[PDB]
């Protein structure tokens, strides 16, 4: 439901803020492909970093303010879409929060 | 005081198109001045070995000897013995190596399985199973081909022939290929190829894609 | 001159509901007048062993000692050592046995697969696969249940945990149940149950029947 | 003089995995420096009895004695004895508690029911009902797990086992979890795990979702 | 197509005569269940003797007259139906010859 | 004086698995007690040349020399020499044959086509066509297998590799198997296995059945 509408610059890094829920172990930052109604997991607690994002992203969880932060290092035109974050085994039936990304260059 | 040899396997023969005779020494303290040669039942010697190995760090020595010969003689059952000479032993040790001549032959049956539905919901990965059953002896070779080009052997796992409970003498094996849910949902036909001596050309291929069990005559779509 | 012990496994614990400490002697010539006892870190002794074994026919002797204790201490990591006294050795040998305390824990994921269509055409048999992936450590127990009653372990085969290529530390295993094409086409739901320490109740059940992937909302029948 | 001994319950044992027994001393004045200890059949000793209950302001005394043991000892038929000494009652007090041997064992049957359509029409709240019937004796532990994580114990209510009306010796119980309708309509899956000491693995799981039980509406039959 | 209409007696044994074809390795004596249009293999060269017929039947092949003979020892009312024999992996798409069996007691 | 040496062909090698080479001596009179032998590059000897061809009644002489070798020696670049001695030509004769090194290698593409509808309407016979195109060099072996058992070699006809019209250096070939229509209409499956020394496993299989290629007719779309 909520949209951070996070913004950033080409290069550098940008931090995505998403809520960390309880009674849900798998936490993911899925990317809304919006092609054939399918969303592909970019990162997860089960340890799966997409090949296109390998070595550029990380996921750190700390239940201090009930928040988990995901950082994306570097930036490319490809990195300018929707990255719905959520929990649960089914990736398409989670997406608790929706966010948008772009590039300023 | 033993010298253990490694006879060529059918998997190695089909992988390299070169049968090789190799023997190693064990239970001997590290030393030098050792020559290894390969001999045959006929009596004449063969090509000279190369690539001397090193000394095992557990107070044992090992020498390797390579000899490339026609696979027909190995299949025929020619007796091949490698002779190693050492200082402590007064008489050189002889190690005869031959293929078991006479085994019931049965062609393997292959079955490919598509990833489970519950696995294609995390949108992360998928595992495809190639299942081989009913084959004697236990010398089988499996590899995966995508789009006519073989994949790297560091992305699939193959097991060892486990005996079948129902049919005694028959064995079975399993190979799993881990792909991406994306790739699988974007066509990409996958092929598992099995090589066994009882097979007619020693080759067998099967493929499965995302759309394989469909009727292909009708197409029902529930839309709300 | 070695004495090798067998610590209780999680599979044995879940199969018998009784953790047991057992140790065997090896590399010792067959003799008599040998007493085996089990001791603990605290220092006090435990129950007496029974069921003396026999002498290995390869010029080696082995003595077995059973001791039943609470699994909590084994999990806690209590140090348990069995003391064996022999004639050739002047001082009795001590063999300390403890569980590795501290292992990353990950719950296994189970996936059942229905027999292939080409297999259900000889009208002879069918093979159902229960596939377990993503679990550390390598102590897993799998068994098959039909109609709430467990089947005999002589009609299914389970493998040993093979490391996962993608995730280091995680392992995977496979279990195959051979049934009849008749039974499978006559309903008969089959359940594979997996027991692991990281599981909440150390139990997990899944079932598959002939009709599992159907839409269950419509029913299309092509008749000619 | 009234001292209560509470044998461990299977529900508590399964809930805490830390089986415990309590020797509650009541009907006495609030006197300090009391001595309470637990002893076995043969008169041995147990661990320290920490966490002594506080005295009550209504002129009653409360004391608890806890003996850490393991389940096989308790369920093997061994009998426990509680020792209580006080200034008011210098005579030692002994109490015996153990398993009530001599009862038949039967496995429960679990039926999970979806919310009523009329309740759903209110578009407010929904209640899933779990019906456990036919189990003997009366020691069943019911729990609800949404996605592998147990829901707060204050969210559901479980009923005491009332005797089955037509079946003598057997019992039945209920359990109601109240969830928000919005969650139920989004495909949220709920399951009712029930633990009894007569089940094969002493665990059983039944699940329910909005699509469970819905019948087929369309029967398309295209003919050529 | 051809029907032996073989006949026998309760007890004893009866021999089923079926043609042994070439270029077909799997040879079976399927039993026409005729329930839901499915035929269950009683015996095969792949080694599968149905449990109900275990230890009572055998299959011997000898290309002398291009014939393979199958013998059924003992007899029960159940042994009084159709046993189509054929070749090939698909059991329902073979059934080269059809035969009938009964009991005389 | 005309003596012909025939280097082994890949088709014959794959067909017989017994690679052989022939030194044919012609243009001579029918004279007996001839001496023919095969020798290697370094002048060694080979096995006996049995099965000497019979003389022809048209005043011509025929003789064949067979040297049993293994494929790696022939394909490694080693050159062979034939020795022919005769009373008419006492001078020794030498001939050199080997692989023609210096040619690019490309893999064929196989397309299998079903019989024409008009041919099927005759309700008499049907012809399946196999089109192998784009392979270089010209040494392709085509075979037909119905159910894993090769059909009689006199049932099908294969064409010599004619150069591809638009692609220089590449070639194409045809193969026609004539089957009875009744068999084709009963779902009989046919495949076209083609062997070339540029394929990954040097083997490739393409199959065809009555249902292969047929399009979808009904597109049901039920909406609520
Ligand atoms: C039968 O109809 C279905 C539903 O319209 C088709 O499925 C679509 O296929 C296209 C690609 O061909 C995808 O882009 C869509 O996402 C599919 N739909 C759904 C709901 O996933 C199917 O392709 C049709 N069959 C054929 C042979 O065309
Ligand atoms: C949907 O229709 C099909 C076709 O009529 C049903 O399949 C039949 O099921 C019965 C048992 O219920 C079998 O005796 C028949 O052999 C089946 N038909 C075929 C062609 O195999 C199917 O049962 C129907 N679905 C439901 C839920 O009843
Ligand atoms: C569903 O359709 C099939 C095929 O036409 C038919 O046999 C069956 O009776 C139908 N179901 C009902 C409930 O009529
Ligand atoms: C088949 O039906 C689907 C769903 O109604 C539709 O999208 C598609 O266009 C149809 N195919 C053709 C060829 O019209």
Author numbering:
A (entry chain A), E (entry chain B): 20 to 124
B (entry chain D), C (entry chain E), D (entry chain F), F (entry chain C): 345 to 568
Question: What do the study's own words say?
Answer:
In this study, we image a complex of the ectodomain of human FcμR and the IgM-Fc pentameric core using single-particle cryogenic electron microscopy (cryo-EM).
Two binding sites (position 1f and 3f) which have highest occupancies of FcμR, reached high-resolution (3.5 Å and 3.1 Å) in the cryo-EM maps, thus allowing the atomic model interpretation of the FcμR Ig-like domain and the IgM binding interface. Due to the quasi six-fold symmetry within the Cμ4 domains in IgM pentamer, the FcμR molecules at position 1f and 3f share almost identical interactions with the two Cμ4 domains (Cμ4-A and Cμ4-B) in subunits Fcμ1 and Fcμ3 respectively. The Cμ4-B chain of the IgM subunit (grey in Fig. 4b) contains a central hub of residues (Asn465-Glu468) for FcμR binding, which interacts with all three CDR loops on FcμR including CDR1 (Arg45), CDR2 (Thr60/Ser63/Thr65) and CDR3 (Thr110/Asp111). Furthermore, additional contact from the carbohydrate chain extending from Asn563 on the tailpiece towards the FcμR is observed at subunit Fcμ3.
